[PDB]
Design a protein around this ligand. Structure first.
Ligand SMILES: CCCCCCC/C=C/CCCCCCCC(=O)OC[C@H](COP(=O)(O)OCCN)OC(=O)CCCCCCCCCCCCCCC
Ligand SMILES: CCCCCCC/C=C/CCCCCCCC(=O)OC[C@H](COP(=O)(O)OCCN)OC(=O)CCCCCCCCCCCCCCC
Ligand SMILES: CCCCCCC/C=C/CCCCCCCC(=O)OC[C@H](COP(=O)(O)OCCN)OC(=O)CCCCCCCCCCCCCCC
Ligand SMILES: CCCCCCC/C=C/CCCCCCCC(=O)OC[C@H](COP(=O)(O)OCCN)OC(=O)CCCCCCCCCCCCCCC
Ligand SMILES: CCCCCCC/C=C/CCCCCCCC(=O)OC[C@H](COP(=O)(O)OCCN)OC(=O)CCCCCCCCCCCCCCC
Ligand SMILES: CCCCCCC/C=C/CCCCCCCC(=O)OC[C@H](COP(=O)(O)OCCN)OC(=O)CCCCCCCCCCCCCCC
Ligand SMILES: CCCCCCC/C=C\CCCCCCCC(=O)OC[C@H](COP(=O)(O)OCCN)OC(=O)CCCCCCCCCCCCCCC
Ligand SMILES: CCCCCCC/C=C\CCCCCCCC(=O)OC[C@H](COP(=O)(O)OCCN)OC(=O)CCCCCCCCCCCCCCC
Ligand SMILES: CCCCCCC/C=C\CCCCCCCC(=O)OC[C@H](COP(=O)(O)OCCN)OC(=O)CCCCCCCCCCCCCCC
Ligand SMILES: [Cu+2]
Ligand SMILES: [Cu+2]
Ligand SMILES: [Cu+2]
Ligand SMILES: [Cu+2]
Ligand SMILES: [Cu+2]
Ligand SMILES: [Cu+2]
Lengths: 382, 382, 382
């Protein structure tokens, strides 16, 4: 939730999430779900979004209904912010543990500093069980195993209640006497010195000394109880390993790209050159989490969110085997209610009417090439 | 105009504009002139100029004597700011349309954010005709063809005059009575409440209600008249395609570079190694829009501004065919009044006495290699 | 001095200084000492240190006990700040001239803007002689040879004394009369106009006119005496040539890296793959200026500061010739008091417990390969 309201061109021109898998659709409490996939950083990064020099891989959900057990970018655990390079592709994996029952829309997201949220496709996952069964065991380097759900709760309650009680006692010591009107009149009359006695001064001295001594003793006792402590671990982790992918033996030029403004579709003229890899055929156009597929060339079998999957939303004028070398100019039409449901038609309000997306080409043997396209998008009103 | 006053080293060390062409020297009104060429970004970019992450290709002229019909960087239209990389070469093309008659010095420039203006060579172009004949037709996506010279002029005049008249009427309603002295005396005397009557309150209420209602009705009518509107299109366009140029089979090392301070020339010792490409010969040294040529090796036939063209300003101790492999140390002398006219001799006031420029080598067949040189420049006073 | 107090991980993860040489250990006054070596910029640059876009090569010493005659980065003199790239290796050379007698700990350092100091290994150098024998001759472009120790000293003294005397005379002219109490009483009584006479006004006018005229005449005389002047030369020098080094035919993966917190050592599990270059053997681990060596494989003969040299501080479970192709998992133990002396054990207070260092592999013929390792460092308390 939160993507439909984001500018259409910003969603089109930031990060592209390609083949994704979810290990389970329905999980029990304390069971783990794995979300893997690839994300590509668009070369034409918008200028109002800072470069992903400081980026964090996040899980979009209405709260800690899951707990993120681990997250890996390129096989490396990423508990901190990371640095990503423009134009590179990265594998990502996220292992989550179920905490609260219910149906949850879970998304993979990249939070970018100086940019904001970049939400990926969301999937509905059902958690069955009771929240009281959730456990979060962690073993420390000191040899102690604790449960993070209730660890250190009683100590915090005790100390906060103790200090609150001390403050309440300090206020109530003075609250046993007339408070506001008689004291104000006495101060106005010049009898302020009569409002504080020697016993009050001794009580204040005792309160101050007891507070300081208790703080010192509590710090000493806490140090004795936990002689081994480390500061909070923070920093930006550089040197993320990107994917070394086969360059596309397929070249695609966008002649024109238009959308009818009333409109639930997008149309584009494309010149495609096959540089080998056998006769190929376009099977899918990915724009903003929406996948328009050509049923005759490719069929999704990964449980891609159906609200974002158009099984026959790709209409190519001529989708015949493009013999290696053939340069065919084709008119592709990407049509689906998701265009209007995911407010991609709101590119009419955007201060930049340019789109970007991914095209997937398959040969007879099923090998897939990914081609990256970007162009300006012209609205049609006649 | 405006380059002679810019620091000599800043002009030497930012952008180099090489082979340029102008389609016409004399044009009529509404006729188009094309300026094409190449620009190279110097690797040793000055630190006080921000990197050209946000750069705009501009035309330097005393105003809209021309209108910039289009501009292309690497074959791509660039109506917005673009991103350029240090050390890369780009083709550029600018098509301008003549608007005002007269002789105009036209320059191609790169405005760089956090840096300032980078002016290129200027050429004198004559426009013959009358300004009243200039037309700027534009066809909109709604099917309307308009002339940008006078489009929406009458509407703006009408609305501004209407609101100015309303304000004048509001002031003049109160201006029919004594204004300053009697009213001031009455306010001082305590008779302020007598200065505003019930009729005045009713008039003020009517003015407020009429203003609000007129604004609302005008907005509704404007929306009805123009139901299709888009916001201003802005942004920085990345992914500019640079030139893939042959690396210079010629290696040049600058041993020493000196200039006499009184002085109208510059001298340099150079070690040149030919790595193939047949016997070569130096034909031209480009510094800051100034081209020093060796008449025996090369002759300009592009109409390069004569104030910046020194046909025999390159004197090479030995400019004989440098057999592939020969490593000759030569003393080159670049001499021309342009050195003093374009204030390149003002490098003596610069906080950085280092120069950069381009050397052009030609073989027997006429093939040209471009070598890029940079060194510190030492003034000579004895 | 000043490195032991710097965070251990910051010292481990910034710049690595490898093979270094000092021309002399004991020098006389006016004699020169050359310090050469290589420095590598770590790929995982810490986020709190700005990238070395503006870096200066500096000499760490308690003052001008030496004078830095020259400094070269990649064979190019670097009197100004320079730009360095992450992940590149550079040669550096520094020629210093002895000025003051005594024993001096001299370090090579890289000052990085927005980062702070990066100190390298320090060496003790003895200077014998008298400071009065030190000379700093410099020949100017005007044909004058001067000594920078005493040049322009007398002129500065004369002008400062002259202006101080003028100010003292101005104060003392008024100081001959009663100063504070009688004048205050007269001003309070309304007799302020009697405290300044016409002669005082004439004296003030003469002082003002003489000051302005003297300033103008002094400027004119200084211009006449030195008709050739240049501004201060400043700027950041880009285009530093890095080393083109053989990629390591040796691959090393860090399985685990741990240190006992009481502790004077560090332990690591490593998987090493030989990709040719004959049977190899680990001979040295460099962490933070500390070099742990395996005496049986390599011996230092460069006079590396002994406080930072552990001749037998590298213990490899199996350090037998790793036949090209062999993938052996070995347990290496780097032990030395320098770990505690140079406060590398203070990584326990660091907000980032990750280390980086260099491994040196030698074959039978003595050829050396450098492998770069980085991992998180886990403290052991049991
Ligand atoms: C829950 C209260 C709201 C917020 C409290 C915030 C800070 C505390 C303020 C007052 C503390 C001192 C009590 C008054 C002097 C406590 C005090 O003096 O009590 C005797 C009073 C005074 O004697 P008197 O002049 O002969 O009688 C006048 C009132 N009948 O008599 C009483 O019968 C008791 C009345 C006082 C009861 C108020 C207690 C509520 C405060 C404790 C709340 C603790 C929880 C805090 C978080 C919400
Ligand atoms: C690092 C330097 C210290 C900071 C400088 C200021 C220090 C001030 C000193 C007092 C100067 C004022 C004159 C008072 C003369 C001595 C003095 O302390 O008198 C009591 C004064 C009231 O002043 P007075 O009676 O008119 O003074 C005349 C002689 N008694 O109250 C206080 O000082 C505050 C309340 C009583 C203090 C008891 C200790 C509790 C507070 C400290 C914590 C102790 C427990 C430590 C935990 C381990
Ligand atoms: C061009 C004027 C300069 C700038 C104007 C700026 C804002 C407007 C100020 C005054 C408007 C109300 C007029 C006075 C009450 C208009 C008004 O009350 O006119 C009757 C006056 C007053 O009657 P009275 O007391 O019996 O006579 C005294 C003056 N003789 O009599 C007149 O004979 C007319 C004199 C007033 C003429 C001034 C008009 C100029 C202002 C309009 C300019 C519009 C263009 C604006 C942009 C420049
Ligand atoms: C979103 C919330 C609204 C903002 C809150 C403030 C609103 C204020 C309300 C009035 C409170 C003061 C008491 C007045 C009582 C009602 C009232 O409006 O009285 C007239 C008052 C003068 O006060 P009064 O006579 O002593 O009031 C006693 C009873 N009449 O003048 C005004 O309110 C201003 C001039 C007359 C207003 C006429 C409408 C023109 C202005 C609004 C635009 C209407 C056209 C819309 C275009 C589509
Ligand atoms: C070294 C002094 C410290 C700093 C000086 C800073 C600025 C100068 C202040 C005073 C200058 C005017 C002198 C007084 C009027 C100089 C002056 O009027 O001298 C005659 C006085 C006054 O005559 P009187 O009323 O009959 O006698 C009263 C004092 N006996 O008599 C004297 O016997 C001389 C006393 C004055 C000597 C003070 C001189 C010190 C200042 C010069 C220092 C220069 C070095 C500067 C850097 C440190
Ligand atoms: C660029 C524009 C200049 C700045 C504008 C202000 C200039 C001010 C002028 C004076 C106006 C006040 C009326 C005084 C009338 C003329 C005048 O200068 O009178 C003397 C006034 C005192 O005023 P007054 O006697 O009541 O004036 C009545 C007629 N004399 O003192 C001063 O002006 C200051 C002290 C005397 C000046 C002598 C010259 C020394 C200062 C300047 C440097 C000269 C040497 C140059 C070196 C090459
Ligand atoms: C959450 C836990 C709540 C803690 C509650 C603590 C109690 C707080 C205040 C008690 C007020 C009694 C005032 C009696 C003066 C009532 C009073 O003033 O009585 C006259 C005495 C006469 O004493 P004397 O013998 O003639 O002279 C002194 C030596 N003999 O004067 C005084 O000066 C008596 C001073 C006594 C002050 C006691 C207050 C100390 C409170 C510290 C509390 C510590 C916090 C808890 C620790 C875990
Ligand atoms: C650029 C175009 C210029 C537009 C010029 C607009 C004219 C402006 C002001 C007229 C002043 C007349 C004042 C008469 C009070 C003169 C006045 O006060 O007369 C006494 C009346 C008595 O009226 P009554 O009948 O006894 O009671 C009300 C119901 N019957 O009192 C009032 O309260 C009369 C109020 C009348 C106010 C009229 C002003 C409205 C002006 C709106 C202009 C709209 C803008 C143009 C639209 C395109
Ligand atoms: C470090 C070097 C130190 C320099 C010391 C300079 C001496 C400073 C002040 C002298 C005070 C004498 C005051 C006499 C008034 C004492 C005074 O006021 O005497 C009455 C005269 C009467 O003169 P008169 O003839 O009747 O009228 C004028 C034409 N004839 O009035 C005046 O107005 C006299 C004005 C004389 C002022 C002289 C002060 C000039 C000082 C400039 C110094 C230059 C700096 C050094 C250059 C290298
Ligand atoms: Cu959602
Ligand atoms: Cu992409
Ligand atoms: Cu010009
Ligand atoms: Cu260049
Ligand atoms: Cu030291
Ligand atoms: Cu390194």
């Amino acid at each position: 939730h939160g993507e439909k309201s984001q500018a259409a061109f910003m969603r089109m021109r930031t990060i592209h999430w390609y083949d994704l898998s979810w290990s389970k659709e329905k999980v029990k409490i304390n069971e783990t779900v794995e979300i893997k996939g690839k994300f590509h950083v668009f070369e034409g990064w918008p200028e109002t979004v800072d470069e992903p020099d400081v980026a964090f891989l996040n899980v979009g959900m209405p709260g800690p209904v899951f707990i993120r057990k681990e997250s890996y970018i390129g096989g490396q655990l990423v508990p901190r912010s990371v640095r990503l390079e423009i134009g590179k592709t990265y594998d990502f994996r996220v292992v989550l543990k179920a905490r609260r029952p219910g149906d949850w829309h879970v998304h993979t997201m990249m939070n970018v500093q100086g940019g904001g949220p970049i939400i990926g496709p969301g999937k509905w996952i059902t958690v069955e069980g009771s929240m009281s069964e959730f456990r979060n065991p962690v073993t420390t380097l000191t040899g102690q195993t604790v449960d993070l759900e209730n660890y250190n709760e009683g100590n915090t309650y005790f100390w906060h209640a103790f200090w609150f009680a001390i403050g309440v006692a300090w206020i109530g010591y003075w609250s046993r006497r007339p408070i506001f009107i008689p004291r104000l009149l006495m101060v106005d009359a010049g009898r302020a010195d009569e409002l504080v006695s020697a016993t009050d001064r001794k009580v204040a001295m005792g309160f101050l000394a007891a507070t300081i001594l208790i703080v010192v003793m509590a710090m000493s006792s806490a140090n004795s109880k936990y002689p081994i402590t480390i500061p909070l671990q923070a920093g930006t982790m550089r040197g993320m390993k990107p994917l070394e992918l086969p360059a596309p033996t397929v070249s695609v030029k966008v002649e024109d790209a238009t959308y009818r403004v009333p409109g639930r579709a997008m149309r584009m003229k494309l010149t495609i050159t096959n540089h080998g890899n056998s006769p190929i055929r376009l099977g899918e156009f990915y724009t903003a989490s929406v996948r328009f597929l050509d049923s005759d060339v490719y069929k999704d079998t990964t449980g891609y969110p159906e609200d974002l999957l158009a099984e026959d939303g790709l209409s190519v004028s001529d989708n015949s085997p493009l013999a290696p070398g053939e340069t065919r100019t084709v008119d592709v039409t990407a049509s689906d209610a998701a265009w209007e449901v995911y407010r991609l038609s709101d590119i009419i309000y955007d201060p930049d009417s340019r789109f970007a997306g991914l095209l997937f080409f398959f040969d007879a043997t099923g090998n897939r090439q990914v081609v990256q396209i970007d162009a300006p998008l012209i609205p049609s009103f006649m």
